[PDB]
Design a protein around this ligand. Structure first.
Ligand SMILES: N=C(N)c1ccc(Br)cc1
Ligand SMILES: [Ca+2]
Length: 223
């Protein structure tokens, strides 16, 4: 997250860190046994880390649970990043509390101009590299589909939205991949892609979770 703020320990209780010997992606806890992330975050050997603030220190609220199964969307296209969503099942259910909590799926798609919270442990610089150890937050609005399509001609599908600031300076970035975009207490987006980070006229692009609710619910019900 570039141009964000330190969230505060366990203030974003649905945030997870995907760990394969190191943090590599975010995710969102959607019930006691399932995480949603980006399909581009797929790999085998995932450990889900819940309750994290400093990903380098054991602070005492963590739960570390191995993935039993990963399901990448059947129509994910790694060239276009269309359908950039994946489900991870935990080997055992998480213990839910005020610091480890599920985030609700949306019943409605969020409108342009809605303010959302994006979070993650990704790079904090638009130029060069600085990875924070503690969770970073950013408040950003969803942009109109026309401003999103004008920023990324020929690249925005109906399964994507833009959020952020056309002026630059404030965005998600590498390492925030798979993390949540939460609006009005519902998961609306997944950190998916963008051109650089925090560049002028190049906002973040996020998977539009409201289009996937039936797939998520039917997948969870049968797996
Ligand atoms: N929001 C962005 N600019 C961004 C997000 C994820 C990745 Br990976 C790269 C760029
Ligand atoms: Ca920790």
């Amino acid at each position: 997250i570039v141009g964000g703020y330190t969230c505060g320990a366990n203030t974003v209780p649905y945030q997870v860190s995907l760990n394969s010997g190191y943090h590599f992606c975010g995710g969102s806890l959607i019930n006691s046994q399932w995480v949603v992330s980006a399909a581009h975050c797929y790999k085998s050997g995932i450990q889900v880390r819940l309750g994290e603030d400093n990903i380098n220190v054991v602070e005492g609220n963590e739960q570390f649970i191995s993935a039993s199964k990963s399901i990448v969307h059947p129509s994910y296209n790694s060239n276009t990043l269309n359908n950039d969503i994946m489900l991870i099942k935990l080997k055992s259910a998480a213990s839910l509390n005020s610091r480890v909590a599920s985030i609700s799926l949306p019943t409605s798609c969020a409108s342009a101009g809605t303010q959302c919270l994006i979070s993650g442990w990704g790079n904090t610089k638009s130029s060069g590299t600085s990875y924070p150890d503690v969770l970073k937050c950013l408040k950003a609005p969803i942009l109109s589909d026309s401003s999103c399509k004008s920023a990324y001609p020929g690249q925005i599908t109906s399964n994507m939205f833009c959020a952020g600031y056309l002026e630059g300076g404030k965005d998600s970035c590498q390492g925030d991949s798979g993390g949540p975009v939460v609006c009005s207490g519902k998961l609306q987006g997944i950190v998916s892609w963008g051109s650089g980070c925090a560049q002028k006229n190049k906002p973040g692009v996020y998977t539009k979770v409201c289009n996937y609710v039936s797939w998520i619910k039917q997948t969870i019900a049968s797996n």
